[PDB]
Amino acid sequence: VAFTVDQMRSLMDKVTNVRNMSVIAHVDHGKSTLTDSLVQRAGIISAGITIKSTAISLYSEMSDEDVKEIKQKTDGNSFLINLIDSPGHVDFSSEVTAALRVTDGALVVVDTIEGVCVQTETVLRQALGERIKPVVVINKVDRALLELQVSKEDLYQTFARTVESVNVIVSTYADEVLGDVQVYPARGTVAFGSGLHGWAFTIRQFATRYAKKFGVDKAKMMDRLWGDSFFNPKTKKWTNKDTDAEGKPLERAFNMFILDPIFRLFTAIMNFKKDEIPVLLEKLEIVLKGDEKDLEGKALLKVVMRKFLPAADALLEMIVLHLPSPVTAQAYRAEQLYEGPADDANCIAIKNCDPKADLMLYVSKMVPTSDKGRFYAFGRVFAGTVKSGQKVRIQGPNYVPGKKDDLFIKAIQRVVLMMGRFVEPIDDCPAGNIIGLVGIDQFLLKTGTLTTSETAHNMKVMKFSVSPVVQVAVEVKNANDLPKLVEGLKRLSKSDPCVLTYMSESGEHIVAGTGELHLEICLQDLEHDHAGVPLKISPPVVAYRETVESESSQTALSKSPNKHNRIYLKAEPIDEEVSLAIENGIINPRDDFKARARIMADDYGWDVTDARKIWCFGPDGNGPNLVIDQTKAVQYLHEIKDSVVAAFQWATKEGPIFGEEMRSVRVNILDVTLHADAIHRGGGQIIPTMRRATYAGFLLADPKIQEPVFLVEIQCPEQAVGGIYSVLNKKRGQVVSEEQRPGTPLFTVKAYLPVNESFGFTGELRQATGGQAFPQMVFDHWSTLGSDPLDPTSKAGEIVLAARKRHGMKEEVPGWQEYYDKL
């Protein structure tokens, strides 16, 4: 249905009537098909900026009698349902957690034949760890009838085992402080159906119909429609034993009043028994309409089943009647989602889903918009209310109430409703609703917390990293399409904050990602959409770093082609502390050289003298590499500065070891000799000098390379935890810590995994832990290999030689002599 901004806002005020949920289902189990049905049923539409669909708004109204069946405070017969989108596979770990983190309820889809699959089982563990209440739906029932041609009782027994399986998981992993969260078909928390044909039902639905034909309050009617309840057709009495006095068998109420009607329609229609079909239909009061009356076979069955038991309604019913509103769930989920004090003013404001308290909005992710390469922050208001214009404290990952690091006191340009693909501006938005923000893309990479309380901690952060540690080179298979790749790449980088496209000096097109999978997906999206041209992609490669271990053996000198200009310098190490401080915005290129000097001097033991002479950082003018101007009385020096800095950007972007970036490299210009006339000290003359002097300096400062390393967190049942360690000892992994969830047998292993050792890691972890393990890895740190990158046979030199040959460079690493003055 369509709605005005007022209706949505008004509807959004009655949080008690909102449902923040996700759909936990394997892709091959109609996750897509069932979700669609709700959209085609209760999808909300508004009465030119498009976005990547991250959530869907669903409206549902119920009878005043129904609103009473809700064992949680409500108000009104209207209900707003936020269907928060989920990943397709599980490998997307980080973003699975993301969707879950903002949901309170979860519609879990299971298969009739296959039951609960390993994957769905895992996600559920995760959902339970977030204290998400589940509601089940056994899908693909049709497959059981048409294919297996199973009996009413065999099918019933199956649902029974299936439901039994789920609850083994639910009870084993649901938090004790939640109470019995198991699903019970008799209680209307388990629907059965077919996404394909578009039908589904709940015991409570058949209980509402047979409601009076027996003179029963549906409470006891639906209680009978499941389990061991029997209605003797002869005696017309209800019994609790599967046999009558003579020992004859009695059909179960479920098989009798639910499965039988359905099974008849299938038998009648699929056997084209035209005499029966009409009679059978009128009995269940199913009226065909015109063109429908002539249908037969599946075509027909499909229409009848949809009109009989509309799938979407069965689900909407369980969603509204059993899933927790933003009010019920936050009370027991708040503490879990606040790395601050339990009693804290904000944590309490979260428990009470209080719209008057300081803002506590969660940004689960940044989503691509059509409005430039801008990204809108997607999230949930856990406390207070967000308003367009309102100025907010944007607390990123590193933030801590103590320091001011990673803070961005900015103003929210616009607040919008994430109506699937389109957005709809709204003044404010009270706690409890999923909303989108406009104008934060440049302060929040992907995740973050927005607040108003100056003493507000961040909410359970979702570790991620924008550090390109895996990259590939993309080439077009048909030279003509080249311009189509040049646009798709621009496009690609425009759709993901953590994907990177850039060009090497060799002129190659580079696509670098956060990890193997993340890169892999980007390459598909490129060749299939952003470009759609047959591309030649090189094998995945790890991003390294070139760095120095000591001060240059001796001064490095280089002179321009003129032979009229000279640069004398020395390279030396930057302490990981400083490199980190640079990488973390503490030491900043945009700072007042003086204020920044004070910081480097005081907190990092730098001569304030040197620090005030920082000429530039690099690469990209902000990297953890510096050039310090230590010259003394060099006339015209400032007239070559822009060139020096330029040379430095290139020397640091692709260093002399094997073209990899430099890191933690300090360059001190000891001296310079320039031609009196500027005509002879231009860019073409100084740039190569400096770049070469630097290479010389660097190569003389005892060279070494750093390999990127992950911090992988793994969830796994104490049983399969063995397979983790099994795989880590074959990947040079280093276990950081292993913990267990108090109640459950769910361990949580954390380790360091060399990125160049993580290829096909998940694949191997899969087999190793029976698929029960839930991997999750982020870039953690750079590790300086000990080996000599110059020695071919050494471990590093082995990396280097391969790389060099791969790049078609001269196998051997240039001596410093090659970049020094040829004297």
Binding site: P688, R692, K822
Partner: protein
């Protein structure tokens, strides 16, 4: 066409495309077979190389009062090499490598190639060069070869009229994309290119 055969030749920062030593040997043999002779190397930026090889050396609006105006080359690739690079950075700041070009002329112009010990800038030079070529500068259908500067390497100046009668082809000598500004490493010159690189013997006495 004087490029020998085998697919289009282009100039890259990664190297000259479709230009192997074997091809160069062929192109060179065929150039001699049509009476042309190698006179030197010319180093420059890619766009320039492209132009020279597929359009021809063209003086293009010169300072007509410039008496040493002409196309400069060098018998020693090492000296030519020093100019095989951008002379000014692109807007972002990159100075990429250039390319070495081999310059040939119709053998019929050899009669106009003269040499001198004098260094071309020096006051005497002008008058002594004009003495050798038999007419006031600028050089026309003639060329002068002499030290780039006292004790430097020798450079050769083909007058413009003569320059436009050259035929230029790529060298198998590669520029280095990872040491732009460095000096030509002698071991990078293919032995087979050296074989076909002798210079003609230039007159020292006017005709």
């Amino acid at each position: 066409e004087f490029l020998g055969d085998g697919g289009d030749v282009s100039f890259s920062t990664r190297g000259t495309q479709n230009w192997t030593v074997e091809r160069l040997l062929q192109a060179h043999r065929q150039l001699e077979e049509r009476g042309y002779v190698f006179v030197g190397y010319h180093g420059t930026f890619l766009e320039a190389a492209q132009s020279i090889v597929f359009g021809g050396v063209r003086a293009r609006s010169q300072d007509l009062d410039a008496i040493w105006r002409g196309f400069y080359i060098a018998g020693d690739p090492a000296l030519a090499y020093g100019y095989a690079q951008d002379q000014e950075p692109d807007a972002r700041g990159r100075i990429r490598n250039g390319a070495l070009l081999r310059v040939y002329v119709p053998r019929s112009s050899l009669p106009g190639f003269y040499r001198t010990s004098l260094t071309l800038a020096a006051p005497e030079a002008a008058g002594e060069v004009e003495r050798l070529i038999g007419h006031p500068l600028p050089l026309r259908l003639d060329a002068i070869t002499g030290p780039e500067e006292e004790g430097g390497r020798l450079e050769t100046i083909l007058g413009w009229p003569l320059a436009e009668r050259t035929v230029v082809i790529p060298s198998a000598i590669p520029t280095d994309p990872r040491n732009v500004g460095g000096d030509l490493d002698p071991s990078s010159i293919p032995d087979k290119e050296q074989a076909i690189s002798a210079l003609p013997d230039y007159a020292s006495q006017p005709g």
